[PDB]
Design a protein around this ligand. Structure first.
Ligand code: AGS
Ligand code: AGS
Ligand code: MG
Ligand code: MG
Lengths: 320, 391, 254, 257, 256
DNA sequence: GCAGACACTACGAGTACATA
DNA sequence: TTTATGTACTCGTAGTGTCTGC
C-alpha cells in the first residue's frame, strides 16, 4: 500500500490571502487587517465550499508567524466544545501571557461555530468582552442564525457570497497550468455548471475527470459526474405538457437511480425557491408536494405517486 | 495603547455625560444608587421620592450594545463603590453561588481598605451581568430579598419565564433604543478623531439597519475605515445590505409580520419571498402555528380575490390549518418525521395567512389554546378521580 | 535569569497547599531580596501576602526584578506530579512567558523537568499599609486551629472579643451559639506554648467561618500564629515562616 | 470428562488477568491449544492490540487435545468472574466446538459448587501473526515507575511522546497546562535488582502516543513487576508485561505527524 | 391508649427498611399479644406478614387494639435520626389523627418530637391458609442475598430444583446460565452458616427476580432465614427476629 | 494497620433541540 | 406550557479507589 498523493483540494489550498478568489472587497479588507494588525472579532458566514475557513487560517498565519504553534487556539466540532470542560480552556488561553509583536494578538479560531450550545456562547460573551486586549476571536459558521444576538453585537460581520463563474474559471486555469493537463473550454464550462459556485466540488470533479479519462472534454465530464438534479427537477416542474414532464421524470430521475423521497424533497426546495410563477400557485404546489411527501414517508414510494404529483401540479399550473 | 485596542473599548464612555441616549434611565440608576444608604437607615419600610426606598435591588434590560454594562460600571465607580461582578464565564450554580458571594453579601472591601475623601469606597456593589446565561435564579431572588450591599442585575429579556420570580423583587430600569442625535454626535467626534470622513445622512441609515446597536455601529465604522476611510451616500445601501442584522422576532411580532398584507402583494414579494416567510416561521416554530390560528379571523382581509368574501377566505384558511394539524400529528408521533417541518410551516402559517392578510380588527391576542388545554387536562383528571371513586 | 534553588520540594508544596484553597490567582514578584507574592481572593474580601527570605532557598540568583502571575490549580497539579523528596528549581528566562520548574532526585537520576505557562494578572499592585493595630495576640497554631474548627460547626459569624485583657472568642448566630472563651497559655518550660496580648482597647470585629477555615489551613507551616487586630484596619493572621512570613488579611464583616 | 479442562490454582489469577485488559477491549478470541492458551483481541478503534498468552505452567492441571477457538465477550466474562469467592479454584470446562463454556467456581474444596456458564461468541477473525520484528530499541523499567510517569504526564497533555537517544529515555507531553519532560538515565543495581533501567540501542526513535491508551496500558501494571517497552519507526509499540508463565503484550499504534 | 415504646431507635428503622420495598404502605394492627401489620403488594402476588413480640423491644403496653394505616416514606424520614443510643416512643390518644413520635436519648439530653399524618385506608386482610410445607430450609441470609443477586443479574427468571442431598439453584438467561448447588452443611461452631433442609417431598418451582430482590433486601433482619417450599403452593420466606418473625410469600409462576 | 481524606470514574435525572 | 422518540448536554450524587497519616 503506497502512500497516497495529496488530493488537489488540499495540495493547492491557498497559503496567502492573495490566492483566494471571489469577494474582492472582503479579501481586500482582510488584507488591510493583515498588514494593519488590528484584527477585530469577526463572524464569517456563507454557503459551504467558497473559502471561509481557509481565509481564517491564512489570516492567522499572516498576522502572527513563528508564534503560530502556540499563539492560536483552534477549535472545531471534533473537539467537545461544551459549556463546562471548554470555558476553562479559552479562559486559560486568553489569560495566558505570551509576548507578541506590538500589533498582533492571540487568535481563537472557533471553527464551525454554529454547532455550539447556547450556554457556551453565553460564557463566550463575557469571555470576549473581558480580554479584548489580549485575544481575538474568529467564528466561521455556515449559518449565522445559530449565533445569538449578543455575539453578533460585538463581532464584525463578514458575509461571503457565492463565487462568480469568472473567478472559479481563473483559479481553475491556474490549477491546469500548474498541473499541465489537456483541457477544452467546453469541458471547463461543464465543470463550472456542475459545481454551482462550490469551489471544492469543482476541484473534485476536475480530479475525477482528469484521473478517469485524461481529457476534461465535456463528454467525459458529463460521463463521470451527472448534472445537478435540482436543475432537472426545476425543468420538469416548469414544463407545460404533462407528457413532457412525465417523460423527464422517468428518463432523468427514475432510470438514473434517484430515490422518490429525494425527488420529492428536491421538488419542494425548488418550488419554495422558485419565483417565476405566481405566489399563490407556489402555495398550492407546495401543499400538493407536501401531500405526496406525506404519502412517500408513510411507506408507499412508487413511480405512480410521483406521476400523480406531477399530474396535480399540472392541474394547478394550467388553471383547470 | 493606541492602534492596538478595539474601537469599542478606547471610545468607551469616561463619565455619565458621554452616554448616547438613555439619559432618563442612567439618571434613575444614579438616583437609586445615590440613595441606597438612606433607605438602609430607613430599614426599607417606605419608598422615597421616586420609590427607591422599597427596593434594595435593581435590574437592567434592553437590546444588546446600548450601554447597560457601561452605565452600571460608571455609576458604581463615580460614587466610589467597589465593583464585585459575576459573569457567565464563571459558575453561577446554587452550591457555588452559596459558596461564592454569599459571604460577600455583608463583608467589606479589603482592596477598598488598601486603595484608600473616598467615604463610600469601602463597600461591595454586586454585578450579575448576563443573568440570562443561567436553581440559580431562585438563589439570586433569595439574595435580592436579603442583601446588605447594593445589588443590580443585567439581563436582556425580562419576558422569559426564568426571570419571572424577579417580577417584584427588583427596581426595574428599562433601557431602550437611543435616539440618533447623540449617536450622530459621538460618531462625528470619532470620525474627526480618527482621520476618516463621515457624512451626516449616513448615521441615520446605519442606526436603522443596525437596529440601535451602538457597539456594532462602532465596529462597522472601524471595519469600513480599514480599507475605505471615506464614507459617502453612494455605498450606503451596499454597506447596509452587507451588514444587515438578521435578528430573531417575537411571537406577537411574528404574527403581525405574517398577517401584514404587503408581503403577499406582487410588489412586496420581490424582496420578501416565501423563503423568508419560512425562515421567519422557523424562529419560533412552537408558537407561530398557535398564534396564526387565534387571530386569522379577526382582521380586515386585504388580499381578497375578486368575487370572494371574507368568510370564504376564513374557511379556506381553516381547511389548511386543519391539514397542518394532521401534519403536526405525524411529525410529533412514534414515527417522528422531523423532515416534515417545512411542510408544516407552509400549511400552518403561510397559506392560512396568505388569504386573511390585512390590518387588525382588534389587536393580536396571546394564544388561549394553551390555557384552555391546561384547564381541560385538569378537569379531565378530576373527572377521572370521581369516575373511579364512584365505580 | 531567575534561579531559585530549593533544598527540597516540600516547603513550597506546603505553602501552596496552605493558601491554594482561598486564592486562585497569585502574582510572584521576584526581587534581589527574594520572592514576594501578592494574592487577592476572587471575592475581594481576603488578601494573602507572602514573602520568602533568601536563606530559605539553597541558592537564589537574580538579575532583574521580574513578576510571575500564576494559576494555583495548575501549579499545585504540577507540584503534586513531582516527588516530595526532590529539589525544586524555579527557572525563568528573559521573557517571562513560562517558568521552568524542575525536580532533581539525589537517588537515581530523574530530572522531571516541568514548564508552566504564566498568566496576565491585572495591573493592581501591592499597597501594603503600616497603620497601627490595637491588638496583637500570638498563640499556638495547632490549638487555635482545633478550637476554630470546633466553633466552625456554628453560625458563619465569628466575632473576636478583646474584653478583660483575655482572648474571648464567640461563634454565636442564628443557628446556635458558639461562645467559647480561652485563657492565655504562657509557659516557661515550653517556648512554643506562649501567649502575649497587647490589650489596647476591647475592639469588636466579626468574620466568616468558611474563609477562616482557609486561613487556618496554612497552620502547618508555622507552629506560631499571631492575630493582629485593628480598630479600623483589617485583621492580620501572620505565620512566621523559617525565613519570611506568610500573613492573611481578612476584611472585617459588617 | 469434558475435552478441555483448565483448573486454576486460584480464581484471583484469572480475575487479575481478565481485569488487566477488560477495559480497553470488548471482544476477545481465546485459542486454546496443547502448548497453552492465547488471546489476541483488538480495540474498537483498532489502535490498541492485546495479545494474552498463558503457559501450561500457570495451571494446576491442564489438558486440551484438540485446538479450540473460544471467541468471547469480556464484559460478561468479567461479570461472571465478579460473582464467586476469590479464594475458590476455577476450572475452565468446554466441549468439542461448544456453544458455551462452564466456569467451575468450586467453593473452597468441598460443599458449594457453582456452574456459571457463558455462551460462546462467534468471532470469525483469525489470530494476527504480529509477534515481533527487528525493534530499534528495547528498554526495561519497573512497572510502578512507568505507571507513575504516565499518570503524572496524562494530566498535562493528551499525547505522550517517548524519545530514546544515546542511552537515555525521555518522555515529553506538551499541552495547555504545561509540558512535562520526565527523563530517565539507565542504571543497574545489585542491591535491588527489581529496579533497573535496562536499555538497548540500534537507532534513535521519536514516537508519540495517545494518553488514554497509555493509561489503559498502565492499568495492567499490577500483573507484572517489570514492563518492557520496544519501539520502532516502522512497527507498533510493544509493552511486554511478564507473567508467572506467559506474558501480556500491548501493541499500541503511534500517531503520525 | 397505645404505648408501643421501642427500646432502640435504629431497630424499627431497620424493620421498615425491609418493609419499604416489599410494599408501599402497611396497615398497622396493635394488640397486647403483639403487633401485626400485613399488606398486599400492587400485583396481589407477594404477601408480607409482621409479628412483633412483647418480651423485647422495651415494655409494650397495648391497652386497646389500635388499627392505623400510614405510609413508610415519612416514617423513614422521621426515623432518620437513628442514633445507636436513641429510643422510641409511640403515643396514640383518642382520635389519633397525628401520632407523636417522641425521641429520648440516653447518652444526651436532647429531645425530638414529630407528628406523622394519617391517611384514611381502613383496609387489612389477614389470612394464613397454609402452614404445612414439604421442604423447610434454614440458611444464612447474607449468602441467600448473594446467590439471589448473582443469579438475578444473569437472568430474569429463577427456578429451584430441590432433589435428594442437593439444594439446586438454576438461572437460565440469554447471556448464559448459572447453576449453583449448595449442600446442607451445619457447623456447631458457626450456627449462622448452618444449613438444614428437611425432606418430605421434592419441590420444583419457578420464581421471579424483582420479588426475590425485595425478599433478600431485608437480609439483616435475621442471621438465619427460614426458607419453606411446598409443591403447588405459595412459597414462604420467613425471616426470624428476636421477638417474632417476618414471612414473605410468592406465587410460583409457571407456563409449561 | 485502620481510620480519615482525597479526587476519581460511574450513574441518574433533568432540560432542549428536531432543515438547511 | 400539551406534543412524544432519540440524541446530546449538564449537573449532581454515590460510592470506589488509591494516597497520607499515627
Ligand atoms: N476563493 C477561493 N480561492 C481558492 N481556493 C478556494 C477558494 N474557495 C475555496 N477554495 C478551495 O476550497 C478548498 C477548501 O475550502 P474551504 O474554505 O475549506 O471550504 P469552506 O469555505 O470552509 O466551506 P465549509 O462550510 O467549511 S464545507 C480548498 O481546496 C481551497 O483551495
Ligand atoms: N450609550 C452609549 N454611548 C456610547 N458608547 C456606547 C453606548 N452604549 C454602548 N456603547 C459602546 O459599546 C460598548 C459596550 O457597551 P455595553 O454596555 O457593554 O453593551 P451591553 O449594554 O452590555 O449589551 P450586552 O451586555 O452585550 S447584551 C461600550 O464600551 C461603548 O464603546
Ligand atoms: Mg471550513
Ligand atoms: Mg453587558
Amino acid at each position: 500500500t503506497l502512500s497516497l498523493q495529496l488530493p488537489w483540494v488540499e495540495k493547492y489550498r491557498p497559503q496567502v490571502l492573495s490566492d483566494i478568489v471571489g469577494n474582492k472587497e472582503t479579501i481586500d479588507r482582510l488584507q488591510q487587517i493583515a498588514k494593519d494588525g488590528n484584527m477585530p472579532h469577526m463572524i464569517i458566514s456563507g454557503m459551504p465550499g467558497i473559502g471561509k475557513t481557509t481565509s481564517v487560517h491564512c489570516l492567522a498565519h499572516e498576522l502572527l508567524g513563528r508564534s503560530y504553534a502556540d499563539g492560536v487556539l483552534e477549535l472545531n466540532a471534533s473537539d467537545d466544545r461544551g459549556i463546562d470542560v471548554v470555558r476553562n480552556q479559552i479562559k486559560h488561553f486568553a489569560q495566558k501571557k505570551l509576548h507578541l509583536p506590538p500589533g498582533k494578538h492571540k487568535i481563537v479560531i472557533l471553527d464551525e461555530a454554529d454547532s455550539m450550545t447556547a450556554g457556551a456562547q453565553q460564557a463566550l460573551r463575557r469571555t470576549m468582552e473581558l480580554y479584548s486586549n489580549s485575544t481575538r476571536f474568529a467564528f466561521a459558521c455556515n449559518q449565522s442564525n445559530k449565533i445569538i444576538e449578543p455575539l453578533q453585537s460585538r463581532c464584525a460581520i463578514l458575509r461571503y457570497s457565492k463565487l462568480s463563474d469568472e473567478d472559479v474559471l481563473k483559479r481553475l486555469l491556474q490549477i491546469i497550468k500548474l498541473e499541465d493537463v489537456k483541457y477544452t473550454n467546453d469541458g471547463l464550462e461543464a465543470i463550472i455548471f456542475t459545481a454551482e459556485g462550490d469551489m471544492r466540488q469543482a476541484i473534485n470533479n476536475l480530479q475525477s475527470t482528469v484521473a478517469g479519462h485524461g481529457l476534461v472534454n465535456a463528454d467525459n465530464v458529463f460521463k463521470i459526474v451527472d448534472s445537478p438534479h435540482p436543475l432537472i427537477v426545476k425543468k420538469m416542474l416548469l414544463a407545460s405538457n404533462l407528457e413532457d414532464s412525465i417523460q423527464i421524470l422517468r428518463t432523468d430521475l427514475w432510470k438514473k437511480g434517484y430515490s422518490s423521497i429525494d425527488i420529492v424533497t428536491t421538488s419542494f426546495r425548488v418550488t419554495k425557491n422558485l419565483a417565476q410563477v405566481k405566489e399563490s400557485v407556489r402555495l398550492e404546489m407546495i401543499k400538493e408536494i407536501g401531500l405526496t411527501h406525506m404519502r412517500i414517508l408513510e411507506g408507499v414510494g412508487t413511480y405512480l405517486q410521483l406521476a400523480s404529483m406531477l399530474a396535480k401540479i399540472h392541474k394547478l399550473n394550467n388553471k383547470a | 495603547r493606541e492602534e492596538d485596542k478595539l474601537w469599542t473599548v478606547k471610545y468607551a464612555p469616561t463619565n455619565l455625560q458621554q452616554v448616547c441616549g438613555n439619559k432618563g434611565s442612567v439618571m434613575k440608576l444614579k438616583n437609586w444608587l445615590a440613595n441606597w444608604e438612606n433607605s438602609k437607615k430607613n430599614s426599607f419600610k417606605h419608598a422615597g421620592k421616586d420609590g427607591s426606598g422599597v427596593f434594595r435591588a435593581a435590574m437592567l434590560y434592553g437590546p444588546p450594545g446600548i450601554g447597560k454594562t457601561t452605565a452600571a460600571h460608571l455609576v458604581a465607580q463615580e460614587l466610589g463603590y467597589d465593583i464585585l461582578e459575576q459573569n457567565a464565564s464563571d459558575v453561577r450554580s446554587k452550591t457555588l453561588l452559596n459558596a461564592g458571594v454569599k459571604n460577600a453579601l455583608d463583608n467589606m472591601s479589603v482592596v477598598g481598605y488598601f486603595k484608600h475623601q473616598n467615604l463610600n469606597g469601602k463597600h461591595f456593589v454586586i454585578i450579575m451581568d448576563e443573568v440570562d446565561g443561567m436553581g440559580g435564579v431562585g438563589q439570586l431572588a433569595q439574595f435580592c430579598r436579603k442583601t446588605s450591599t447594593p445589588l443590580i442585575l443585567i439581563c436582556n429579556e425580562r419576558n422569559l419565564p426564568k426571570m419571572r420570580p424577579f417580577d417584584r423583587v427588583c427596581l426595574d430600569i428599562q433601557f431602550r433604543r437611543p435616539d440618533a442625535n447623540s449617536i450622530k454626535s459621538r460618531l462625528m467626534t470619532i470620525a474627526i478623531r480618527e482621520k476618516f470622513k463621515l457624512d451626516p445622512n449616513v448615521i441615520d441609515r446605519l442606526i436603522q439597519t443596525t437596529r440601535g446597536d451602538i457597539r456594532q455601529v462602532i465596529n462597522l465604522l472601524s471595519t469600513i475605515s480599514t480599507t475605505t476611510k471615506t464614507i459617502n451616500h453612494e455605498n450606503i445601501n451596499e454597506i447596509s445590505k452587507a451588514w444587515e442584522k438578521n435578528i430573531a422576532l417575537k411571537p406577537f411580532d411574528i404574527a403581525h409580520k405574517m398577517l401584514d398584507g404587503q408581503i403577499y402583494s406582487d410588489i412586496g414579494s420581490r424582496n420578501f419571498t416565501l423563503n423568508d416567510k419560512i425562515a421567519l416561521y422557523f424562529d419560533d416554530f412552537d408558537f407561530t402555528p398557535l398564534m396564526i390560528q387565534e387571530n386569522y379571523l379577526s382582521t380586515r382581509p386585504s388580499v381578497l380575490k375578486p368575487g370572494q368574501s371574507h368568510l370564504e377566505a376564513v374557511a379556506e384558511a381553516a381547511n389548511c390549518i386543519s391539514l397542518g394539524d394532521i401534519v403536526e400529528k405525524k411529525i410529533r408521533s412514534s414515527e417522528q418525521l422531523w423532515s416534515l417541518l417545512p411542510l408544516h410551516a407552509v400549511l400552518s402559517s403561510v397559506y392560512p395567512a396568505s388569504k386573511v392578510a390585512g390590518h387588525m380588527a382588534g389587536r393580536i391576542n396571546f394564544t388561549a389554546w394553551l390555557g384552555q388545554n391546561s384547564k381541560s387536562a385538569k378537569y379531565y383528571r378530576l373527572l377521572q378521580e370521581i369516575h373511579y371513586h364512584t365505580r | 535569569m531567575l534561579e531559585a534553588k530549593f533544598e527540597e520540594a516540600s516547603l513550597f508544596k506546603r505553602i501552596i497547599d496552605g493558601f491554594k484553597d482561598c486564592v486562585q490567582l497569585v502574582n510572584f514578584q521576584c526581587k534581589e531580596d527574594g520572592i514576594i507574592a501578592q494574592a487577592v481572593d476572587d471575592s475581594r474580601v481576603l488578601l494573602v501576602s507572602l514573602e520568602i527570605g533568601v536563606e530559605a532557598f539553597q541558592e537564589y540568583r537574580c538579575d532583574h526584578p521580574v513578576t510571575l502571575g500564576m494559576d494555583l490549580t495548575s501549579l499545585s497539579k504540577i507540584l503534586r506530579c513531582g516527588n516530595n523528596t526532590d529539589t525544586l528549581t524555579l527557572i525563568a528566562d528573559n521573557t517571562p512567558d513560562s517558568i521552568i520548574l524542575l525536580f532533581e532526585d539525589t537517588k537515581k537520576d530523574r530530572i522531571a523537568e516541568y514548564s508552566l505557562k504564566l498568566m496576565d494578572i491585572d495591573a493592581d499592585f501591592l499597597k501594603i499599609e503600616e497603620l497601627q493595630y490595637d491588638s496583637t495576640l500570638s498563640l499556638p497554631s495547632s490549638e487555635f486551629s482545633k478550637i476554630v474548627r470546633d466553633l466552625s460547626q456554628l453560625s458563619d459569624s465569628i466575632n473576636i472579643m478583646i474584653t478583660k485583657e483575655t482572648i474571648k472568642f464567640v461563634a454565636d448566630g442564628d443557628i446556635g451559639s458558639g461562645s467559647v472563651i480561652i485563657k492565655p497559655f504562657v509557659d516557661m518550660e515550653h517556648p512554643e506554648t506562649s501567649i502575649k496580648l497587647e490589650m489596647d482597647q476591647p475592639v469588636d470585629l466579626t468574620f466568616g467561618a468558611k474563609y477562616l477555615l482557609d486561613i487556618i489551613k496554612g497552620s502547618s507551616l508555622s507552629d506560631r500564629v499571631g492575630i493582629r487586630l485593628s480598630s479600623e484596619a483589617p485583621a492580620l493572621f501572620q505565620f512566621d515562616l523559617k525565613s519570611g512570613f506568610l500573613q492573611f488579611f481578612l476584611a472585617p464583616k459588617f
